[PDB]
Amino acid sequence: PLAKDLLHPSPEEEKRKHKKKRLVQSPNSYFMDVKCPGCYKITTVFSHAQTVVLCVGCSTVLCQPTGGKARLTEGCSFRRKQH
Amino acid sequence: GRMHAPGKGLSQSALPYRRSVPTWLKLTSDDVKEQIYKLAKKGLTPSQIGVILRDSHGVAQVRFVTGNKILRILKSKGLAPDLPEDLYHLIKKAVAVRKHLERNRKDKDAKFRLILIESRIHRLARYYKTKRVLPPNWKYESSTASALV
Amino acid sequence: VRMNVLADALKSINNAEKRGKRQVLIRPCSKVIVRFLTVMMKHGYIGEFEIIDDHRAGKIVVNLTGRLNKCGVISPRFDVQLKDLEKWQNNLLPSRQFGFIVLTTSAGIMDHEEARRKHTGGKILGFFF
Amino acid sequence: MQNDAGEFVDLYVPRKCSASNRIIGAKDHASIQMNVAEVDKVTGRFNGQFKTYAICGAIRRMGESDDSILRLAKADGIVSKNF
Amino acid sequence: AKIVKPNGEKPDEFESGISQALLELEMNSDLKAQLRELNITAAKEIEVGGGRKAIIIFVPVPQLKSFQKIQVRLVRELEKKFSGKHVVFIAQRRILPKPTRKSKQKRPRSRTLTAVHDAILEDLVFPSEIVGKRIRVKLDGSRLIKVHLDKAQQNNVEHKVETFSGVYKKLTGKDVNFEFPEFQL
RNA sequence: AAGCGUUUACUUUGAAAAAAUUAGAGUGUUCAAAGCAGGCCGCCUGGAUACCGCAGCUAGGAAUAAUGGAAUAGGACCGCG
Ligand SMILES: [Mg+2]
Ligand SMILES: [Mg+2]
């Protein structure tokens, strides 16, 4: 197509674009609240944690790093947050 | 492209447009930096000080919560290293490779790499000397590099 | 690497214009490119344009018409007097009626005709016709 | 084309593509001059008026002629605004 | 009198009206502790779109963050006093001239004209944060800034958008339009 | 009105830069190449002007391109002993 609008893409085709190739840059990662089934405090964990995060008090461990998104241990509920 | 490789990669970090502290983050600037100081006392380069802050504490970029970057915080307190950490890791790597070569000498490929690490040191060494962070007499010696890890 | 950012804007505009596209995206934005594009508007060679403002060297979306033949940059930026201005437009412009040389002076970036009226030369940047 | 006296010296003013806005040459045998009928609003019958579009041969070879026709008609109300 | 004029002259009655319009607010409302250390520099009334007025309040930069901590509630309680006005807070910032060859230590980038205009705009709309910016350069040669605001805290500022364009036009001299994109945020 | 006040590169300006040659003004060597002569019934007159890179000197302009400032403050102004 010739008269393709470059100013206004729909969010469908803007989400699939590469993080650096968007109209304006925006990371694909996020933060989230991870609560152990045992304790009561909620910790903030990066999606791509890149480190082994464990809850304070030496109760259990929270996430295991991988090559992409970090994977959470069994039973740990998470909810992402916005601002 | 890479300085010493034929690859042309694109993987890198993308800062979001918004540069304000999030509303859910309650840790404040004055009590951010003393956590940085104690993590530096454990012994940690500023590269990995910020890594374990944005996954365990929710502080994305200290330059936004605090008024300055991590290395500026450390040096204003007096905990900056003797030599820059990026230059340090080149020297540590060159020592490891050079030690591998004395054990086995037919490793022609390993010898070829040693020029590439050493070339990167000298290119990086003259940069820091123009910025007056290393003394004008600072020279990289392969024999005595092992002592300073 | 990328040594000149104006050369990438003009070449990108020319590639899209020559293929009949309606909008083109200039990836790095600079004060020189924005000032060069406004000179391109006072004579109706392009439409209006946007400046997407991220916190880095921004982007630019230009509304293209079919009114452009070739925009080109001249590198390096030679210093040209007003005595030598006649020669330059005799080599890189199609005819004496149309086509403009965009050169930067102490009074700002401007075309060769309106630079001659205020009696001031400078450094050439490019042209269009 | 104009001279000092304001006379018209050019032999003929050539046509111009309605999609790319470039001169259609005298030997551009692939160029077309489309005619589209306009109908009455209440009834929908050919009145006798036309909305004329012209596409040069370069666009037709490029495979963009049909889209170019569609947007021109859409801007003229012939095609529905949402399409 | 909470007004401190930097040049040391008496403020006029209108902003002196603002002075005890806040001292009385200090002693009666829950702001016994917060307003004690705060201060006000200058105030002005602005003629804006239509037969409508608007008020802008200059605040010293060091205490600006403190005002934002109470800005939403303070203006509401200040609004129930001033009936048909819109009141917003902007810092008192200095624009040092660009150095020329005919003329003093280095000018920081904060005191530049570019870094002060966006600072003024970014603080003009406090409760909502800028999420994008576009500049439209029309055919006549003039510019037009388009500002994008987050959907969160949209119903708290939707009625103030006409005020924002009027205030920024008088402070700077820039044609500006505000919009709220559902696209991302 | 004396002087003072980041430095250049760049651009416009002004001076100074031998003639002859080249370009060019006037001028019927019978025309021309030339020459600097001639014209009017003692007088009227001409023997101009442009260019002369680069380097050096002078004053405006501040876009473009370098360079400098306050970051172990060994900082700028302001007054006191
Ligand atoms: Mg190389
Ligand atoms: Mg001579």
Side-chain angles (χ1 to χ4, degrees), chain E residues 134-153:
Chain E
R134 274 91 168 114
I135 294 94
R136 163 75 76 190
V137 190
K138 329 176 296 172
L139 271 293
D140 63 59
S142 61
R143 262 163 176 181
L144 188 153
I145 300 172
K146 292 186 289 184
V147 184
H148 301 271
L149 295 159
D150 62 358
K151 295 318 289 283
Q153 298 294 318

Side-chain angles (χ1 to χ4, degrees), chain E residues 62-155:
Chain E
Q63 296 86 26
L64 186 76
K65 180 181 176 183
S66 296
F67 274 66
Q68 322 294 317
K69 193 141 183 143
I70 62 171
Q71 189 275 331
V72 189
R73 193 179 340 142
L74 179 62
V75 301
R76 177 193 294 109
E77 294 193 3
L78 189 152
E79 182 63 26
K80 62 153 180 82
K81 293 176 190 173
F82 293 121
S83 309
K85 309 300 192 291
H86 266 308
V87 176
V88 289
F89 294 165
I90 56 175
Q92 187 79 52
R93 286 214 174 73
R94 176 172 277 93
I95 316 181
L96 297 178
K98 174 181 278 190
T100 61
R101 286 181 173 88
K102 267 181 302 306
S103 66
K104 294 179 179 178
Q105 61 183 355
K106 180 140 63 158
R107 172 176 64 126
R109 296 289 267 283
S110 303
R111 275 70 162 179
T112 54
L113 187 48
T114 298
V116 71
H117 281 329
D118 66 352
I120 277 176
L121 191 52
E122 191 166 69
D123 292 332
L124 175 62
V125 295
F126 164 41
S128 55
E129 182 155 356
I130 324 298
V131 295
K133 190 177 288 191
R134 274 91 168 114
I135 294 94
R136 163 75 76 190
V137 190
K138 329 176 296 172
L139 271 293
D140 63 59
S142 61
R143 262 163 176 181
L144 188 153
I145 300 172
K146 292 186 289 184
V147 184
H148 301 271
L149 295 159
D150 62 358
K151 295 318 289 283
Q153 298 294 318
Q154 183 293 349
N155 294 257

Side-chain angles (χ1 to χ4, degrees), chain D residues 60-79:
Chain D
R60 276 168 51 94
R61 287 185 225 102
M62 201 165 68
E64 311 266 19
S65 66
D66 79 326
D67 172 23
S68 310
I69 301 299
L70 184 55
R71 68 181 65 252
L72 291 183
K74 204 182 301 173
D76 266 342
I78 294 170
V79 181

Side-chain angles (χ1 to χ4, degrees), chain D residues 9-79:
Chain D
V9 298
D10 73 14
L11 183 63
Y12 82 104
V13 55
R15 294 172 321 160
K16 204 182 291 163
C17 172
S18 60
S20 63
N21 203 265
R22 67 184 68 188
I23 297 169
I24 291 172
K27 297 293 189 231
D28 196 345
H29 297 316
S31 66
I32 59 167
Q33 190 164 117
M34 185 64 73
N35 282 314
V36 182
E38 290 146 290
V39 303
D40 163 28
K41 324 162 211 173
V42 65
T43 306
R45 166 172 288 91
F46 181 39
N47 309 91
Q49 291 76 340
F50 302 107
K51 279 278 181 317
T52 300
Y53 303 150
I55 308 284
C56 68
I59 303 306
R60 276 168 51 94
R61 287 185 225 102
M62 201 165 68
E64 311 266 19
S65 66
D66 79 326
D67 172 23
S68 310
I69 301 299
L70 184 55
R71 68 181 65 252
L72 291 183
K74 204 182 301 173
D76 266 342
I78 294 170
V79 181

